[PDB]
Every structure is written in C-alpha cells, then in structure tokens.
C-alpha cells in the first residue's frame, strides 16, 4: 500500500527493481497521474443570499 501525499501532484513515476545474486538488475517503471489539485485547502465561505448595494458583508476564509 502506497500513501499518496500532495507532493506527488500532479504526476509521479514508480520505478522499481530487483537484483539476482549481486549481478543481475531488472526493473520497470509505471507513470501515474494524481488528481491535478490544490496541495492544501482554500475556500471562500459565504451565505449566497442576495445582497444589497454598499451593504455590510461577511465572508469566512478557510485555508
């Protein structure tokens, strides 16, 4: 089980190999696309109700 973590965004490769008797090396690499997303979080939270001109406003900021 591998645990993907932000770092590997957006795309990480996996190479791996084994050696027989300290003489032979054989390997393989597969390439994977991680969801091209935000490493951390950022959302502007609000109320979405119809505001009125020059009126007083509150927006929360999650990050």
């Amino acid at each position: 089980n591998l645990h993907i973590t932000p770092d590997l965004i957006p795309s990480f490769r996996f190479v791996a190999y084994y050696q027989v008797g300290n003489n032979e090396i054989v390997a393989d690499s597969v390439w994977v696309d991680v969801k091209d997303t935000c490493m951390g979080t950022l959302v502007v939270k609000g109320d979405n109700l119809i505001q009125m001109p020059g009126a007083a406003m509150k927006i929360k900021l999650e990050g």
């Binding site: 109320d47 109700l49 009126a55 007083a56 406003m57 509150k58």
Partner: protein, 50 residues
Amino acid sequence: IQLKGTVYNYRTSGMQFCVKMSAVEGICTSESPVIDHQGTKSSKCVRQKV
C-alpha cells in the same frame, strides 16, 4: 380593535420596510390615508426599520 402584527427579518444586517393595509367599506381606519393612485386603494407608507 387594535390588530397586532409582527415583521421578522432573518437576514444578516438590518432592513427597512413598508406595511400598508387596504381599507374596506365597513371598517373606519382613523386616518384618511385612503390615497387612491393608479387604481389602488391603500394606506400611507409607514417606513419602519427592523
């Protein structure tokens, strides 16, 4: 009688409002606010803040 009513404002900040009631043949109103204009018979414009 004295009809009670209550206006609630649920929204964020403050909010102002008008409450006018149509009068009817059989109900004295105490004001001559009858003001008929463009087909409409109604009360003066309050102008409360809530």
